[PDB]
């Protein structure tokens, strides 16, 4: 359960600094076959960004991942 979510986070957090950045999210999305504007990527960060620092920490990832 939690090891799967930690693993998914690591796939996005490519530099391992504990924060998914816009550039990292662009990268992952692009290499799954998506063509995204700077606008659409920012929009994706906002799905999870709660403190409004413009990136997704692990805690923010958890709560996006476990709510629907």
């Amino acid at each position: 359960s939690e090891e799967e979510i930690r693993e998914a986070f690591r796939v996005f957090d490519k530099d391992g600094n504990g924060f998914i950045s816009a550039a990292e999210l662009r990268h992952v999305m692009t290499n799954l076959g998506e063509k995204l504007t700077d606008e659409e990527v920012d929009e994706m960060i906002r799905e999870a960004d709660i403190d409004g620092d413009g990136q997704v920490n692990y805690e923010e990832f958890v709560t996006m991942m476990t709510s629907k």
């Binding site: 796939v11 999210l25 992952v28 999305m29 994706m44 799905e47 999870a48 991942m65």
Partner: peptide, 24 residues
Amino acid sequence: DVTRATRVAYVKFMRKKMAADEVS
């Protein structure tokens, strides 16, 4: 390949783009 949780994260991240592609 996507590790299942990553696919769920990809769909969740895509929520607003998906909604707006559904409209268009």
